[PDB]
Amino acid sequence: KGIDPMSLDVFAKHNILALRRAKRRNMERLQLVTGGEAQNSVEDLSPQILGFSGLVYQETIGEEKFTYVTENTDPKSCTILIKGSTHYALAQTKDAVRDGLRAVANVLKDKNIIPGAGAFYIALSRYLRSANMNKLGAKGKTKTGIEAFAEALLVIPKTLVKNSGFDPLDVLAMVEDELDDAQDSDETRYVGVDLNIGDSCDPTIEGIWDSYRVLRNAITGATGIASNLLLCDELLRAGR
Amino acid sequence: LRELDIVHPAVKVLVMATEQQKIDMGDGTNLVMILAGELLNVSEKLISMGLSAVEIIQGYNMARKFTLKEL
Amino acid sequence: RQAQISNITAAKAVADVIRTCLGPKAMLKMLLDPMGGLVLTNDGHAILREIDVAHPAAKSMLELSRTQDEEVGDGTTTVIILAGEILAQCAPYLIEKNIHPVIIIQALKKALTDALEVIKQVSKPVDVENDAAMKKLIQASIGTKYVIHWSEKMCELALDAVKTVRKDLGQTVEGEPNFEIDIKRYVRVEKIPGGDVLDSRVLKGVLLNKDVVHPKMSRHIENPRVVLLDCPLEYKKGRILQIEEEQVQLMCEQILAVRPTLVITEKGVSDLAQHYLLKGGCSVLRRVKKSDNNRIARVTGATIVNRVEDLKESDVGTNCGLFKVEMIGDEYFSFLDKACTIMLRGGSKDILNEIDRNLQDAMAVARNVMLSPSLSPGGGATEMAVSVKLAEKAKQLEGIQQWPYQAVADAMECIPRTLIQNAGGDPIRLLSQLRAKHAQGNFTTGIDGDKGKIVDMVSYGIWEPEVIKQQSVKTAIESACLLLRVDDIVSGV
Amino acid sequence: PKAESLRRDAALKVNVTSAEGLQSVLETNLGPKGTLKMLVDGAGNIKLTKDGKVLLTEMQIQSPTAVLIARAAAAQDEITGDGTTTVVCLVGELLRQAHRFIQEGVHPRIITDGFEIARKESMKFLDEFKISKTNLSNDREFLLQVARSSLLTKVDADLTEVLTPIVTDAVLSVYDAQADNLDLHMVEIMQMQHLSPKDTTFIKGLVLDHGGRHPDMPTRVKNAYVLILNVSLEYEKTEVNS
Known part of the structure; x- marks a missing residue:
C-alpha cells in the first residue's frame, strides 16, 4: 500500500528503501522466492518471519526505478528481462525466449537427443531407399510410396541452402559421397550440411542438436495430414 | 514523421529507428535516415546480380564490427 | 418427362458424393460450410445431414437414412448407393426406351421376392x-x-x-x-x-439418480416392501400447526398399516411427512417420474394407485432382492435389482x-x-452373388417385365464396384472375373478391401447378419418405387 | 444416357496447388539462414517471428485445403513446441512428389498406404539413430550448443552470444536435483523500452516494476532484511465517522 511523504524523510535517515503500489500477483511470488511469510499484523510480527537476500542495488532511471529481490538462497524462480528500443525488437526476442526455454527443458525431461542440420533427414532418406530392395516384403506398387517418401525428406537440406544462395545439387553430392565411404569403412560417422562454409560438417563437433520429441511427432504428424489431403475425393461448397 | 501517418511497413522501420535517435541524444535524425537509405540503394546492384539478401545482411554485420572498432 | 429427369438427377447427385464413403478404405470427404468451417469425417450420416438441398428427392434420402440407422448400426452408404443405382440403371429404359413407370414398379415387386430368396440360399447358419x-x-x-x-x-x-x-x-x-x-x-x-x-x-432392474431424503439410512433391507403412489403426502386444502401436523400424520398412518420398509412418492415430499416415516423404518424417495412407475412396477409388482387411501392390500414387496443406498462417484444411487x-x-x-x-x-x-x-458374407460377396443368380432366372422372364428386370442385375454390381474403385484395382478386370467366378466356383468368394484381389472368405470371414442385406434390398425397392411414382412437380400452397 | 466418365482428379490438383503456394511462402523462414516475415494488421502492429503457428493465427485462410495444415501446426506447438514450419514443408512438398504419380494413374490409397509402411520403418530406425543423454548437471557446457539451435534461427545471430548464458542458466536453475521435473511458469518474461537489445542481462530472482522515489534512498545494499507487510504505512482514517 501507499506511504505518505512524511515518513520518507524518517526512512531516509536509516537508509531504508520504501516501496508502494505493488501488484497483488507479484506479492505471492516473493513468498516462494525469499521464503518469508506475509505478515498481516505488526503486533504479530516476529524476527523469524523475515528472510535473507543478496546484493540489492537500485538502478537510476528518470522514467522508472527497479528493485532487485534477486540473489536468494533457494529462490527456485527465474526472470528474463527483454530489452529493446522499438516494438518489434521486444516481440521478436520474446518468441525466441519462449521457444528457447522449452527446447532446453525437453533435453532434461527426454534423455534422447537427435542431431539437426538435416542429419536425420538425409540418413533416413538413404536408408529407406536401399532397405526396400533388400526386404521386398510389402508389395510392388508400394515402391512408389516409399520412393516418394524418401525424396520428400530431401527438401529440408535443399531449403536450408536455398536461402543462403548455395547450389542445392552441389552440396547434395558431397553428402552422398561421404555416406558411401563411411558405410564400407565399418564405423559410425554423422554427416550434416554446414550453412556458413557450404561443405559438410560433423553435427557432434559443430554442436547442432534437436529434441527427440520434436522430430518424433514431426514425421508422424506430417504423414497423416499430408495423406488426408490425397484422401479428399471431392471439394463441396455450400451457401456460395 | 510525427505529423505524417506512416503506413508502408518498410517505411515504419526507418520511422521507429528515428524515434530511437530522439532518445539518448538530440543529433543524428538526418544521419540515420540518409545512411540507412543509401545502404538499400547500393544493395540494388547485389540483388540484380543474383546475390541473396541473406549474405548481404551477413556482410554488413562483419563490416559493422570493423567500423565500430576503428572509431 | 422433365420431372422424371429431375428425380434421377437429384437422386444421383446426392448419392454420388457418398459413393466413396463405403468400406474401411473409404476416402475422406470435405464439406465447406458457409461460416468458414469444414468437415473432415467421412461418415455419410454427418455429411449429408449438414448439406442443404432443394429438390425433394434428396430430402427423401435423408429421411431414409435416419430410418435405416434405427434398424442397422452400419451400412448407411450401402442403402443409398443401392437405391440410387436402381434409378440410374432405369434411366435409359424410362426415358430413352419409353418404358412405362408402373411396368418398372411391377417388375421391382417381383424382383424383390426373388432377391430375398437368393440371400437365404447363400446364407449360413450360426x-x-x-x-x-x-x-x-x-x-x-x-x-x-x-x-x-x-x-x-x-x-x-x-x-x-x-x-x-x-x-x-x-x-x-x-x-x-x-x-x-x-x-x-x-x-x-x-x-x-x-x-x-x-x-x-x-x-x-431400474436405476434412479435421486438421493434419499435422510442422510443416514439402512444400507441393505432383508425383505424390502415397495409401495407406489401418486398423490403426495401434505396438508390438504379446503392452533393451525396442530392441524397441519395431525393431517399429515393421518395420511402417513394409512400407509404404515401394512408397515412397509420402503416408501416411493411420485410428487414432492414435505418435511412434515419425512419425520413421521423416519421412525417407521422406511425410506422415502421424493420426485419420482411417472414414466418410471411403469418400469418400477415390473421390477417390484406394486400396483399403481392414485389416492393414498386407495392402496390395495395386494401390494407386496416380492421380487426385490436388495435395496442399497451405497454412493458411487459422489452421487447417491438406488439399487432395486x-x-x-x-x-x-x-x-x-x-x-x-x-x-x-x-x-x-x-x-x-x-x-x-x-x-x-443366418449370416451373409461381406465385402461384396452377397451383392455379386445375387446379380449372378438374377441373370440365370431370365429364361422364364420373357415379356415386357424382362427389360426393367435387367436394371436390377447391373445395380447389384455397383456395391462391389465402389470398393474396387477405392481399392485402386482395375474395375473392369476384377468385376469380369468375379462375375464368372460365381458361375463356376462357390458363391462365398468375395473381394478383400485391404488388398483388392479376388480371394476366398475362408481366410477372413467378415460375416454380416442377414438383416443388413434384407433391409438394404427392401428399402432400395421402396425408394426406387417412391421416386418413379411421382412424375410431376408442383409448388405453392 | 446420364454420364459416368472420370473421377476427374481436378479437386485433388487444386488441393495440391493450394499447398504448393503455402509452402513456397513459408519455406523462406526455415533455418537460421532464413528470412524474417512481417505481419501488419492495418492498425500499425508489427510482429516479427519465424514460428509457424504464431504467423498463421494472425492470418485468415479462405481455402479449406490449407485450413487442415494450420490446424495441424497448432497441435505440434502444444506437444513438440518446435519445428512447426518444418512440418508444413513436409506436407506440401510430399504432394509435389506424389503429383507425378497421380497423373500416371496411381490410386491415392496405395500412395497413402506406402507412407504408413515407411512411417513404421522410420520408427525402427529412429530408435537406433537416437542418442541417450545423461541427466547429470555437467552437461551445461554441452547445453550451450544445443540452445543455439533455437536462438540462431530467430535472430541475426549478433544477439545470440548475449542470450546464450541467459537461456541456459534459466532452465538449469529451476531444475530440481535427483532427476526431477521443472516448471516453465516459474521463469518470468518481461519487456521494457528505451534500451538497446545488447544490454539484456539475466535476472536470478524476481524484479519489481514501480520503485521508491527519493534522493536519499540507498544506491546499493550488500545484505538486507526482507519483510512482507499488509499494513498500510501512510495516513489512514478513523473506522467510524468523525
Whole structure:
C-alpha cells in the first residue's frame, strides 16, 4: 500500500528503501522466492518471519526505478528481462525466449537427443531407399510410396541452402559421397550440411542438436495430414 | 514523421529507428535516415546480380564490427 | 418427362458424393460450410445431414437414412448407393426406351421376392447361444475404434443386455414372435461418471439418480416392501400447526398399516411427512417420474394407485432382492435389482460419450443376429452373388417385365464396384472375373478391401447378419418405387 | 444416357496447388539462414517471428485445403513446441512428389498406404539413430550448443552470444536435483523500452516494476532484511465517522 511523504524523510535517515503500489500477483511470488511469510499484523510480527537476500542495488532511471529481490538462497524462480528500443525488437526476442526455454527443458525431461542440420533427414532418406530392395516384403506398387517418401525428406537440406544462395545439387553430392565411404569403412560417422562454409560438417563437433520429441511427432504428424489431403475425393461448397 | 501517418511497413522501420535517435541524444535524425537509405540503394546492384539478401545482411554485420572498432 | 429427369438427377447427385464413403478404405470427404468451417469425417450420416438441398428427392434420402440407422448400426452408404443405382440403371429404359413407370414398379415387386430368396440360399447358419461366436460378429463394429482394447468386456455388456429383453418361445397357436427385442426403452444405457470400464456390469432392474431424503439410512433391507403412489403426502386444502401436523400424520398412518420398509412418492415430499416415516423404518424417495412407475412396477409388482387411501392390500414387496443406498462417484444411487439397466463407467465424460455411440452400434449387430440364425458374407460377396443368380432366372422372364428386370442385375454390381474403385484395382478386370467366378466356383468368394484381389472368405470371414442385406434390398425397392411414382412437380400452397 | 466418365482428379490438383503456394511462402523462414516475415494488421502492429503457428493465427485462410495444415501446426506447438514450419514443408512438398504419380494413374490409397509402411520403418530406425543423454548437471557446457539451435534461427545471430548464458542458466536453475521435473511458469518474461537489445542481462530472482522515489534512498545494499507487510504505512482514517 501507499506511504505518505512524511515518513520518507524518517526512512531516509536509516537508509531504508520504501516501496508502494505493488501488484497483488507479484506479492505471492516473493513468498516462494525469499521464503518469508506475509505478515498481516505488526503486533504479530516476529524476527523469524523475515528472510535473507543478496546484493540489492537500485538502478537510476528518470522514467522508472527497479528493485532487485534477486540473489536468494533457494529462490527456485527465474526472470528474463527483454530489452529493446522499438516494438518489434521486444516481440521478436520474446518468441525466441519462449521457444528457447522449452527446447532446453525437453533435453532434461527426454534423455534422447537427435542431431539437426538435416542429419536425420538425409540418413533416413538413404536408408529407406536401399532397405526396400533388400526386404521386398510389402508389395510392388508400394515402391512408389516409399520412393516418394524418401525424396520428400530431401527438401529440408535443399531449403536450408536455398536461402543462403548455395547450389542445392552441389552440396547434395558431397553428402552422398561421404555416406558411401563411411558405410564400407565399418564405423559410425554423422554427416550434416554446414550453412556458413557450404561443405559438410560433423553435427557432434559443430554442436547442432534437436529434441527427440520434436522430430518424433514431426514425421508422424506430417504423414497423416499430408495423406488426408490425397484422401479428399471431392471439394463441396455450400451457401456460395 | 510525427505529423505524417506512416503506413508502408518498410517505411515504419526507418520511422521507429528515428524515434530511437530522439532518445539518448538530440543529433543524428538526418544521419540515420540518409545512411540507412543509401545502404538499400547500393544493395540494388547485389540483388540484380543474383546475390541473396541473406549474405548481404551477413556482410554488413562483419563490416559493422570493423567500423565500430576503428572509431 | 422433365420431372422424371429431375428425380434421377437429384437422386444421383446426392448419392454420388457418398459413393466413396463405403468400406474401411473409404476416402475422406470435405464439406465447406458457409461460416468458414469444414468437415473432415467421412461418415455419410454427418455429411449429408449438414448439406442443404432443394429438390425433394434428396430430402427423401435423408429421411431414409435416419430410418435405416434405427434398424442397422452400419451400412448407411450401402442403402443409398443401392437405391440410387436402381434409378440410374432405369434411366435409359424410362426415358430413352419409353418404358412405362408402373411396368418398372411391377417388375421391382417381383424382383424383390426373388432377391430375398437368393440371400437365404447363400446364407449360413450360426449358433446364437455360443458366446465365442458372438464375439467375432460384434467385432466388425469393434475394430478400428477405441473399444478394441475392451472388446472382451464390451461383448459381455452387449450380450447380457439383450438376454433379459429377449423371450424364446414358439408354437402353432400364438405364432412365432421372431425374438422381438426393444433396445430403445429397455436397453437404454445410463452413463455414470467415474469408475472403470472393466468394472462395468449389466444391472437387471431400474436405476434412479435421486438421493434419499435422510442422510443416514439402512444400507441393505432383508425383505424390502415397495409401495407406489401418486398423490403426495401434505396438508390438504379446503392452533393451525396442530392441524397441519395431525393431517399429515393421518395420511402417513394409512400407509404404515401394512408397515412397509420402503416408501416411493411420485410428487414432492414435505418435511412434515419425512419425520413421521423416519421412525417407521422406511425410506422415502421424493420426485419420482411417472414414466418410471411403469418400469418400477415390473421390477417390484406394486400396483399403481392414485389416492393414498386407495392402496390395495395386494401390494407386496416380492421380487426385490436388495435395496442399497451405497454412493458411487459422489452421487447417491438406488439399487432395486424383461428389462435390464446398462451401467457405463469411464475416466471422463468424453470416454462415456464415445462408448455410447460405440455400444449402440455394437448391440445393433448382435440384435440383427437374434432376428434369425443366418449370416451373409461381406465385402461384396452377397451383392455379386445375387446379380449372378438374377441373370440365370431370365429364361422364364420373357415379356415386357424382362427389360426393367435387367436394371436390377447391373445395380447389384455397383456395391462391389465402389470398393474396387477405392481399392485402386482395375474395375473392369476384377468385376469380369468375379462375375464368372460365381458361375463356376462357390458363391462365398468375395473381394478383400485391404488388398483388392479376388480371394476366398475362408481366410477372413467378415460375416454380416442377414438383416443388413434384407433391409438394404427392401428399402432400395421402396425408394426406387417412391421416386418413379411421382412424375410431376408442383409448388405453392 | 446420364454420364459416368472420370473421377476427374481436378479437386485433388487444386488441393495440391493450394499447398504448393503455402509452402513456397513459408519455406523462406526455415533455418537460421532464413528470412524474417512481417505481419501488419492495418492498425500499425508489427510482429516479427519465424514460428509457424504464431504467423498463421494472425492470418485468415479462405481455402479449406490449407485450413487442415494450420490446424495441424497448432497441435505440434502444444506437444513438440518446435519445428512447426518444418512440418508444413513436409506436407506440401510430399504432394509435389506424389503429383507425378497421380497423373500416371496411381490410386491415392496405395500412395497413402506406402507412407504408413515407411512411417513404421522410420520408427525402427529412429530408435537406433537416437542418442541417450545423461541427466547429470555437467552437461551445461554441452547445453550451450544445443540452445543455439533455437536462438540462431530467430535472430541475426549478433544477439545470440548475449542470450546464450541467459537461456541456459534459466532452465538449469529451476531444475530440481535427483532427476526431477521443472516448471516453465516459474521463469518470468518481461519487456521494457528505451534500451538497446545488447544490454539484456539475466535476472536470478524476481524484479519489481514501480520503485521508491527519493534522493536519499540507498544506491546499493550488500545484505538486507526482507519483510512482507499488509499494513498500510501512510495516513489512514478513523473506522467510524468523525
